[PDB]
Each structure stands twice: as structure tokens, then as C-alpha cells.
């Protein structure tokens, strides 16, 4: 399975690192893709294992939690108005504008999606489009990818 609806894409105002998690978690609650307190577990994992990815030009974060809190594979994408700091995933303060929240319970799907994410964020042309395109265009270009 995949699952990625149009209301799994949204912009966020000039927000806390914690607030971002909740904002993206809510549609995944509204469809039963995850447990009631999915955002709670995601937040806690981030404080121990940060997901900030230092890539230029657009900072990226991939917040998630253990697959045992998922019910159906899903992805939520957020575009931050102003850069919000995420701790570096490698222990090294990363300014993030794009957030890929992963609610994947299947390991092979987790590794497939992470592989795909890696290739996309290394494309500084598509990363730019994400900063200007709207909720429809972003959803459209992203949906194609299988």
C-alpha cells in the first residue's frame, strides 16, 4: 500500500517544532492510518533521534516513529513559511522548510520511501519547485512517483 491524499499536503505559518508534528499528524488521525496519539510518539523519537537533514538549498526533516504505531502506510508533506530548526540527524541545528512525515508500518516500504526521498532532496530543481508551487501542483508532481 501507499496512501497519500490531497489533504496530506499543507503549508505552515511563521510554528514550533512540536506544533509541526501535530499539524501534519492530524489528517493521519482523521483516516485511522495511525493510533490516536501518533504525534506524541513522533515527537518523543525526534528528541532522541533527530531527523533534520542538512541539504542545500532546502532543509528537510523526516519525522517518524516505530512502525508498531501505524495501521496503514501513509505520507504527510509540509512546507514551512519560515525555516524551523531541527536537530541534526548525525549529532552535529538544521534550518528546515520541507517536512516529510512518514507513517509507514512496512519495513520494505520504509526503505523504499527513504531511498526515493534521498534522490528527490538531492535534486535542487524539484526542491525549488516545492517552495513556490501550491498544494495542488506539489500534490500532483509528488503523486506520480511510484
Amino acid at each position, epitope marked *: 500500500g501507499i496512501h497519500f491524499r490531497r489533504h496530506y499536503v499543507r503549508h505552515l505559518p511563521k510554528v514550533s517544532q512540536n506544533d509541526i508534528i501535530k499539524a501534519l499528524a492530524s489528517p493521519l488521525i482523521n483516516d485511522g492510518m495511525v493510533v490516536s496519539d501518533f504525534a506524541d510518539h513522533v515527537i518523543t523519537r525526534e528528541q532522541n533521534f533527530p531527523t533534520g537533514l542538512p541539504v542545500e538549498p532546502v532543509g528537510v526533516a523526516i519525522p517518524h516513529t516505530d*512502525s*508498531k504505531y501505524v495501521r496503514q502506510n501513509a505520507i504527510s508533506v509540509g512546507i514551512l513559511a519560515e525555516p524551523v530548526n531541527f536537530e541534526d540527524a548525525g549529532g552535529e541545528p538544521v534550518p528546515v522548510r520541507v517536512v516529510f512525515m512518514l507513517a509507514l508500518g512496512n*519495513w*520494505f516500504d520504509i*526503505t523504499n520511501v*527513504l*531511498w526515493w526521498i534521498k534522490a528527490v532532496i538531492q535534486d535542487e530543481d524539484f526542491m525549488q519547485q516545492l517552495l513556490v508551487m501550491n498544494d495542488d501542483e506539489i500534490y500532483q508532481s509528488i503523486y506520480t512517483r511510484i
Partner: antibody
Amino acid sequence: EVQLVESGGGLVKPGGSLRLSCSASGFDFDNAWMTWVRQPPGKGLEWVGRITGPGEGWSVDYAAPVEGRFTISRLNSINFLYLEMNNLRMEDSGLYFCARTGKYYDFWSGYPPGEEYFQDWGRGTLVTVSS
Amino acid sequence: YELTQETGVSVALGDTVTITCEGDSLESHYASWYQKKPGQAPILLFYGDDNRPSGVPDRFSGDADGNEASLTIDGAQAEDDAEYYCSSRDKSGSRLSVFGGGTKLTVLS
């Protein structure tokens, strides 16, 4: 540390059947991936098969030599892993281990589906296939 | 299948030694490493890029390059006399796993 206890080993005739069991405690068994591994006498370790967890729908993968002959299952309610072995041959003889299996994927350098590693092992049960 | 290792390697007590493992799948996948002594269950030593389980001594370390992965023991002790097995995928992208044939480390002197 955690405890893995295999049993069911013994003597079986070629062509015969056998069922091994592994009892597990000390970790989250329901969410754990579990692997069977064997060691023929005087030889190395040989991966037999692995059963995944609920997110992967309990899917099982098998080594080529046992595919179609062996069946791995699990009973989570009592924390048991099983290996059901049909049409046994002499080359199936050996010490059979069950192992709690971790999954690893490095984001920047990894390739799907990452790697599995074996963090805890039982002591094994001995299977002898002979006439 | 088929990761491959030397059948045996020797090392002077207190000296450095490296055990190698080779295979196509190592181009894309990390190896994990196990120590095994006769009559005793395998012990995980090292896995992934740079991961050492908490109880494993610091002198064990792994590396990887091309189709090769290596376990280095920096200053071998008698207790390190054992069989060492590497493990990884059988092919790039495969859902199956495999072991190398094992390398016998003998500690001399």
C-alpha cells in the same frame, strides 16, 4: 539478557517430517522479526528463513534449499516460533538456532531493503536425519 | 547465496588482525559480524556503518569498501580465538540473507 529456547530436535528418517519450536521472552515478541539458522556438523552457519511482523503481514522468506519444504510460523499469544520441516534429507541435519532479528538502514548510503542482523540467539536444537 | 571468507587467519597475541568478507551484495549492503565458539551461541559484534552492541569490546571494529567488508581486531587476546562469520543480503535488493563460510582466527604465542 533475553531468553530463546529451541526444542523439538531429534532423529528423523530421510523423507520424514519434524517440527521445531522456539520459546521467547524478555523482549517485544509480537513486533519482533525472527530468523531460523542452522549449522550442519563441522560446517558454518546457514540462513534458513525469516518471518516478519504485523506491518509486513507475517511474510516469510526462505533459503533456496528449503523453499517449498520448510514452513515458518509463529504463535504470538504464547510467544512461540515454529519451523515445520517436511521431506527431510541428510543435508538438513544439524544444529538449528532461532534468532531475534534487527533491521538496519543507513539513510545516506543505504539501499533497499537495508540489512537484517541477529542480535540474540538461542542455544539451538539438534536435528539428525538418518536411516 | 555466497559471501566468501578465508578459511583461517593467525595473529600474534596482542597484535592487530583483519578478517575479510567479499561479495557482490556488499557493493550495496553492509555486513554484520558474529563470533562463534564451539558449543556456544553466536554473538553479534558489529553491524551497519559503525554500530557496536554495548557489551562488545572496543578493539573490535568493522569497515567496508567496494565488494569487501572487514572486521578488525586491534590487539587480539586469547579469548578472541574463535570462528568469525559475516552476514548480509544474498543479492543487492534481495529480501533473503546469507552467511559467509566463516574464518578461523587462531591467536598465536
